[PDB]
Automatic annotation (TrEMBL):
Gene3D superfamilies: 3.40.50.2030, Bifunctional carbon monoxide dehydrogenase/acetyl-coa synthase(codh/acs), Chain M, domain 3, Bifunctional carbon monoxide dehydrogenase/acetyl-coa synthase(codh/acs), Chain M, domain 5, Carbon monoxide dehydrogenase alpha subunit. Chain D, domain 4, Carbon monoxide dehydrogenase alpha subunit. Chain M, domain 1. Keywords: 4Fe-4S, Iron, Iron-sulfur, Metal-binding, Nickel, Oxidoreductase, Transferase, Zinc. Zn(2+) binds at C509, C595, C597. It comes from the Bacteria. The keyword Iron-sulfur applies. Transmembrane segments: none annotated. The keyword Zinc-finger does not apply. It is an enzyme of class 2 (transferase). The gene is acsB. CDD domains: ACS_2. It comes from Carboxydothermus hydrogenoformans (strain ATCC BAA-161 / DSM 6008 / Z-2901). Residues 38-119 form the Carbon monoxide dehydrogenase subunit alpha ,N-terminal domain. [4Fe-4S] cluster binds at C506, C509, C518, C528. PANTHER family: ACETYL-COA DECARBONYLASE_SYNTHASE COMPLEX SUBUNIT BETA 1, PTHR42281. This is CO-methylating acetyl-CoA synthase.
């Protein structure tokens, strides 16, 4: 049996209980359950017991309840017994265990109150607007899971209350955002940060939940991790708490004047293993060592929370004028805020990584050749050519394309730095706010140098960065860059599932999905969409002991569906033996599993005789009778699910795309925007198959319908080949 409570046994010596804290927790838990009970009785009197209740866009009903006790709450009456249960577990005796049970009851009460609040919520007339999030949908949790698994998001800060001043709120939050922690904000700190023009919203991984009971939208976010990637069953309470403590490195920052309900909520965080750190001074009888502690000095509170939680940060430490971290990757710079730009079809541009010989490379040398961003009035433009020379003993020409990709990400982490595209199609923008802080191309070169030295210590011994901004000179060197681009394109042309004798595992997502195993082949990218076969091969050649390992293609069992003994044995050994077999070219029998970060899901529809596909960003209903989030609840979690499978979007353009099932010809329904994202690949592959370039017009989408009865007549009138193919079954 998991004995999770053992994690608290050292906290309080007997007879020295902090009775002020336990009394405040008791009063706040009773108040929260009472709030929830009256609002529930009123709603049941007004709408009736059977009225549906729930949150927008989640597969997990009321996730806090769904995780800790497993109930599938759907209607108001379902809430009644649960709340009664929770009220019954609030007890006067002042023990640490009773405080934790009161905190769980407070969390249950906040979840109930919020679902009741959402009874009045419609997408057309919502109860919250951006940047505020309220309840955060499943797609955002999944969209940041990939950053969680490799600790690009080292942890999470749940900040409730009010910083002593708005400037202090801005400082601690800018610090956290530069450390890459995911933030949940509640109460007056939000307006404090907005008045300091701190950037907030889901794009910045800094969620303004709202006030008061909206605090629970951090809890139901965190618990979803274990429900989704961890695959833990609903209702396995101690297993969920153990997943939270082990992998959701959250802590609470309790700022400003205390009140009973906030304190009971923080105790609910402690109940699942998240320490609480407050800016208030604390008497002995209102603190718990390593669980409810005071750090009044704002200069130290962040490092205090990080150390008590166990979070370790690895910053490049270079003193750059602008903030840097994952939160800023998703920013975009409006034309009115843009100080200068390069590339994007407005000026010549290229970026290139290139291996060099040892004797004429100067490690750390960052040079800007040509005018700097000093040169232009705001809104102007310059050419940019970036060349990162690299020498290392164990550097390989193979690594050049891989490291080149990093530039995009390295640039977008800078606040006011923006980057898109690649090679000679780059577009880069620098905001007026960054220019006013002193940012110049020098800092871009130093940033790329430090991030390359930090991310590849084993293979980079020397790195040099040159940024050219003369038009003619950029055009001249762009031809050399294009030469290297063509070489890489040819090496990529040579690869195929048959020509290579080694496929590659990837185990990264096992930090959160312990049983999941990805197998990457030249014609099948990993389901995150970011790990191609060349990427896994380079990661293994750089770190032989890492999460990517070679697997020889041996012991063939089924050439058609794509089963080999070697991959079977590897997946069985590395899946904690939940998975014995896997077919690479079909979803209908022994499909590869998923963690929860798949870019899209495929599913077989017998009534259409073919596949639907739905990407994570699509909002609406699909012909199988489920949204992407509901389908993802079944497809993720490391279980084998014949007839369903998660995939990267680019996989749809592979020649091996579910080849044993009929490939692209079997696809009958995709979202319109997904078809348009992939229009060129789909047209080219469809012509290769003999389906015609107009085959994309025969694929149904949501503008055709969202049910089988609406879609089938369109497929029949359009003569879709899948209808005349063999049923998959
Ligand atoms: S390839 Fe698979 S396991 Fe690796 S990061 Fe991508 S989704 Fe996760
Ligand atoms: Ni994942
Ligand atoms: Ni995943």
């Amino acid at each position: 049996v998991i004995n999770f409570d053992q994690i608290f046994e050292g906290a309080i010596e007997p007879g020295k209980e902090p009775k002020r804290l336990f009394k405040e927790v008791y009063e706040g838990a009773i108040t929260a359950t009472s709030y929830a009970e009256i609002l529930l009785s009123r709603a049941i009197e007004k709408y009736g017991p059977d009225h549906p209740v729930g949150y927008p866009d989640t597969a997990y009903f009321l996730p806090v309840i769904r995780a800790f006790s497993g109930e599938e709450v759907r209607t108001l009456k379902d809430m009644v017994p649960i709340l009664n249960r929770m009220r019954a577990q609030i007890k006067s005796e002042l023990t640490f265990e009773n405080a934790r049970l009161a905190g769980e009851a407070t969390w249950y009460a906040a979840e109930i109150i919020e679902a009741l609040r959402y009874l009045k919520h419609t997408p057309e007339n919502p109860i919250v607007v951006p940047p505020w999030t309220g309840f955060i949908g499943d797609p955002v949790v999944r969209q940041y899971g990939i950053k969680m698994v490799d600790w690009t998001i080292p942890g999470e800060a749940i900040i409730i209350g009010r910083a002593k001043d708005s400037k202090a709120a801005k400082k601690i939050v800018d610090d956290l955002m530069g450390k890459g922690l995911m933030l949940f904000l509640c109460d007056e700190i939000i307006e404090q940060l907005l008045e300091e023009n701190v950037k907030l919203g889901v794009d910045y991984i800094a969620y303004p939940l709202g006030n008061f009971t909206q605090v629970v939208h951090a809890a139901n976010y965190a618990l979803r991790a274990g429900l989704m990637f961890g695959g833990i069953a609903p209702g396995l309470r101690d297993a969920h708490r153990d997943y939270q403590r082990r992998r959701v490195l959250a802590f609470v920052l309790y700022l400003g004047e205390h009140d009973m309900v906030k304190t009971a909520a923080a105790m609910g965080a402690i109940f699942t293993g998240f320490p609480v750190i407050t800016d208030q001074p604390l008497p002995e009888d209102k603190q718990i060592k390593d669980w409810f502690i005071s750090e009044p000095d704002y200069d130290k509170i962040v490092q205090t929370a990080l150390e008590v939680r166990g979070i370790k940060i690895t910053s490049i430490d270079i003193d750059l004028p602008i903030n840097f971290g994952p939160a800023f990757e998703g920013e975009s710079i409006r034309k009115g805020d843009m100080h200068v730009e390069f590339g994007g079809g407005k000026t010549p541009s290229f970026e290139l990584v290139r291996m060099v010989g040892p004797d004429e490379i100067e490690d750390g040398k960052v040079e800007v050749i040509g005018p700097d961003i000093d040169s232009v009035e705001p809104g102007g433009r310059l050419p940019i050519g970036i060349v990162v020379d690299i020498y290392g003993r164990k550097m390989q020409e193979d690594f050049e394309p891989v490291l080149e990709r990093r530039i995009h990400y390295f640039t977008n982490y800078g606040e006011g730095f923006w980057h898109t595209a690649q090679r000679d199609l780059t577009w880069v923008r620098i905001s007026k706010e960054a220019f006013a802080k002193g940012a110049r191309l020098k800092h871009l070169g130093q940033l790329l140098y430090a991030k390359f030295k930090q991310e590849f210590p084993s293979i980079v011994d020397r790195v040099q960065v040159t940024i050219y901004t003369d038009e003619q000179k950029v055009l001249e060197l762009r031809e050399i860059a294009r030469k290297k681009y063509a070489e890489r394109d040819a090496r990529l042309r040579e690869l195929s599932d048959e020509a290579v004798d080694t496929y590659y595992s990837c185990l990264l997502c096992q930090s959160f999905a312990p049983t999941h195993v990805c197998i990457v082949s030249p014609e099948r990218v990993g389901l995150c969409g970011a790990i191609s076969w060349l990427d896994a091969k380079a990661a293994y050649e750089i770190n032989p002991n890492g999460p990517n390992q070679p697997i020889p293609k041996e012991g063939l069992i089924d050439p058609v569906k794509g089963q080999w003994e070697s991959f079977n044995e590897y997946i069985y050994k590395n899946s904690q033996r939940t998975i014995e077999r896997m077919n690479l070219y079909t979803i209908m029998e022994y499909p590869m599993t998923s963690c929860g970060c798949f870019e899209a899901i495929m599913a077989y529809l017998p009534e259409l005789n073919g596949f639907m596909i739905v990407n994570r960003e699509h909002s609406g209903m699909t012909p199988i009778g489920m949204t992407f989030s509901t389908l993802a609840g079944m497809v993720g979690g490391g279980t084998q699910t014949p007839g369903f499978m998660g995939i990267g979007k680019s996989y749809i353009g592979s020649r091996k795309f579910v080849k044993a099932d009929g490939g692209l010809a079997r696809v009958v329904w995709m979202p319109k925007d997904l078809k348009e994202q992939l229009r060129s690949i789909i047209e080219e592959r469809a012509e290769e198959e003999g389906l015609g370039r107009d085959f994309i017009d025969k694929i149904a989408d949501e503008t055709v319908g969202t049910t089988v009865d609406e879609v089938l007549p369109f497929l029949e009138e359009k003569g879709h080949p899948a209808l005349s193919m063999e049923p998959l079954l």
